[model samples]
Target chain A: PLMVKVLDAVRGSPAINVAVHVFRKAGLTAEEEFVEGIYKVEIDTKSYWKALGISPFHEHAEVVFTANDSGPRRYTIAALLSPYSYSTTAVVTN
Target chain B: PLMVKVLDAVRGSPAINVAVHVFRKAGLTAEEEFVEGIYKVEIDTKSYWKALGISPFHEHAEVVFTANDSGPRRYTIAALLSPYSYSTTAVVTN
Candidate 1:
């Protein structure tokens, strides 16, 4: 029900091996049970930047929002990260 | 030191009149004085989506991070917003 795509804005490449954590309100869970409600996504941005030898602005990038608030839907989150900044966007469907 | 650009991914055009709030930690400030430190950018996503007659996922999209943490730099924040998702990216330079 949820997917994430991340990119390195500085290097123009996929942010490989970047850790991503998804939560409804608490601890770990599976993709199949990700239901309609608020969700928080924590992206290990610092680790990625560190691996690239770049000192980044954020230790982690966290996006919190209500998912499928209107109806049943799937989510695809996209992110672009730079040393000083990052951007995130989502594509949602039924 | 700071600038922002917003786009409506669904319509593929600029997201106009979307309120943008820049904060260091509290109230409002000036762009010329925006210097080295952490900052948060709040994009009025809900209002934008509402105006388009669409229901959105988040109330507002917030990006938080340190600015010019490594050195003196300027920032251009680009945002892409859809009904259920949004993406953000930043271009920073000295």
Candidate 2:
């Protein structure tokens, strides 16, 4: 019961966001600010560490997703954010 | 004068199609037969080699293109085939 609230609180706070690991392509970078668990420009290292229950955020790799007639609508959010969970350097730091 | 005709003949013939190098993504393959110099399942090794003024085609890497709302209309053809020219190991052999 108590843990649920903590997780909910963490989820509710906009101050929280984990850095995501990019698959690493030739020309790609995700340097945008978070929008509805989407893309985010920067992440608070302290907040990240607290949420992790280990250490604060620092640096991680990134990639940019563009919209076109090739695949899905939002290239990064669903394709990236939704797929990979937090708790690793894979989280988006910035 | 003579070479131009030969090249033109090669281009005009449906048997001619130069394999293209793929960018190597998660899930992609170009096993489909060439359509309008676009794609082809099998490329005659002799024809490919002849086109290159070499020996004969054998094997090369391949990737598939699909239609989605992410980037280009055709994932592989426009992005892969057009970018990397034939006369290379990057060309399609199968």
Candidate 3:
């Protein structure tokens, strides 16, 4: 199992969508989950933050999630932003 | 003297300006500084990271700088993003 996470500092922003792509590249799927009044996403454990060139301890750090894939895979994470929230995408391994 | 710092995870994106305002509200001014192959800005000691609702340990943390003003002043910090880097602005104490 692999995990990836998308975290947003701004509340109610629509950037969560971008995070979805980031997870895909990391060989995982992203699902939105609300925690403590903040919007977050959980990715499978197969995907890791380092794959996206992200540091877990950083503020505005993407939330972490986990998933399982049948074969070895790779992913790419990219972020997009709107006026309010930013979106992240992960290109997953096939 | 006050110090405000702006840190960007991206290498050459112009989002540094937003951090400037974070310092202005803290009673400081911001100027660009390059250190260790990275673009950075320096704000006065009057402004502090805690005032901007930011945690220093976080990545993408705003670079810090220092400046001085005669009277008590308050400023607001905001960030702007370009394709490459982010710009931060600090309103001075007036």
Candidate 4:
């Protein structure tokens, strides 16, 4: 119940109102127009992906998320340089 | 923008406006409870297998969708027995 446990954290503390909503589910990995109902979460993925003075798209960088401080989500980015878990992230254009 | 192109079929047509929608993304294959926000689309996948008169759980079946007649959706189930495209389908219990 990790998801439930995490999602429940926001229950009483009106201050925190989010949980690890599925950024995307397992299905067709595509680049398409962003739909109104869906979203791509923003992250500090900037450091991990320097843009190398170029567009970050081709770098094929995927972002990671983990809990910080505690119950409330003060979000940021991370990498797959280890055994931690994460999923690919994206926002589409064109 | 295949998604947009397909999703757009639900435009002014009113009566016959439906298009392809991604049922899933290519990611972790897990069976979890049916969450409220996310949902498992319904299909007449029942006859796909005889159920072998057995529990469909371990049968490991997936459903396919394709356009029939014209716009709008009257989705039924199908199999990977194809030169056509399809993605796996699932619902969760317990």
Candidate 5:
């Protein structure tokens, strides 16, 4: 499965507005969502991973997210990297 | 004004869930939006660049947006980067 991690942090003050944009390169679509003063998102999309060339046995898929808010904030963005593999099957009957 | 270009292409079929995540590292906010079976997005935010240290004369701010859906998809992501300069001033009248 593919895992997307979001790093959230607060600096100076709280009352901050947050906005998120998800871009799907493979699916050819983009989605947007907004939240107020909240941090962190862990998204698991097995189907997305498989379609993106990552195999089921791959274990993990890494995605990058860039975030900003109303106040001056700093965060460390990271993801767990792992190896992936793919397979195909074909069947015939007589 | 900063221009954000989104490359749109289709392969095989449509019927996709387009999710967009916009992350703000300096402003402390993340927004998400979802669109079904659509391609292309052009977002411009001068305020975001000003807070991120990029000067007004910088021309454009490059933001990375990851998009995905139900079916197999492929896309090429690119952005225009230009040199920027900053200035600070304090006002005092006597």
Candidate 6:
């Protein structure tokens, strides 16, 4: 299973209305059961910043990685967003 | 100016001994005066996990963006690293 949480680093609050699109799926909390394979998460970063009247650097933020079925694994993607940059970290467990 | 900080999502502690390579330059706190331009920061994600006896997915983590001199700006890149993924966020001030 998988879920996503987004935070605005500059604002220091939950990033609301942020679109999160996963490969073959879709954002602030898109939870789904994933099988073993590679996945891609694209965050609508520019829109988030644009809404705040600021033009951002990257059109969006991307996180692409592999997933393995070591067991019924759980993956939580925590994203920190900023106008110029963003960070994505995962908490993975079985 | 620019600086970097890394945190381990799994360990919930500061990620020490992580290597950071900047374009036209060079890890945990690589601070320097950066002029307006495009820059790339490569975090040695594999080595960080390898040091902990864990094989990670990504060979490294990269954060690339353009910087402008709206004024004398300060940039702090905060990175959260995990075995499977990593997140990077920037706090920019002028």
Best candidate, TM-score-wise? 3
- Which tens-of-lDDT digit does each residue in A1-94 have in candidate 5? 2234322332322121223343333222233543322222322212212122212123332434444323332222121111111211112222
Question: lDDT score of model 1?
Answer: 0.26
When candidate 5 is compared with the true two-chain complex, its DockQ is 0.04
What DockQ do the predictions score, one after another?
Answer: 0.03, 0.02, 0.03, 0.02, 0.04, 0.03
TM-score, candidate 4, is 0.14
The docking category that best describes candidate 5 is incorrect
lDDT by residue for model 1 (A16-63), tens: 222222332210111332222112222211211111112222344354
Q: Using TM-score as the measure, name the better of candidate 3 and candidate 6.
A: 3
> What is candidate 4's fraction of native contacts?
0.02
- What is the lDDT for A43 in model 5? 25
Give the whole-model CA lDDT for all candidates, comma-separated: 0.26, 0.21, 0.26, 0.24, 0.26, 0.26
Q: Give the alpha carbon lDDT tens digit for every residue of A4-65 in model 3.
A: 33331333322111212111121222223211212222222221222232232356444333
Writing each residue's lDDT as its tens digit, candidate 2 over A1-94 gives 1111111222211222222222213301123222122232221111100111111122232323232333332212112222212212211312
For candidate 3, write residues B1-94 as lDDT tens digits.
3333233132322222131221112122232321121122222222122222223237654433433234333222233122222222222332
Which portions of model 1 miss their true places by more than 4 Å?
A1-68, A78-94, B1-32, B35-44, B48-94
- What's model 1's TM-score? 0.14
Q: What is the lDDT of residue B53 in candidate 3?
A: 23
Task: Show where candidate 6 strays beyond 4 Å.
Answer: A1-94, B1-70, B80-94
Ranking by DockQ: 5, 1, 3, 6, 2, 4
Predicted chain A of model 5: TM-score relative to the true chain A? 0.18
* lDDT (Cα, tens digit) per residue for candidate 4, span B1-94: 1121222112221211112233345421223333332212322222211112222223333423222222243222222111111222232223
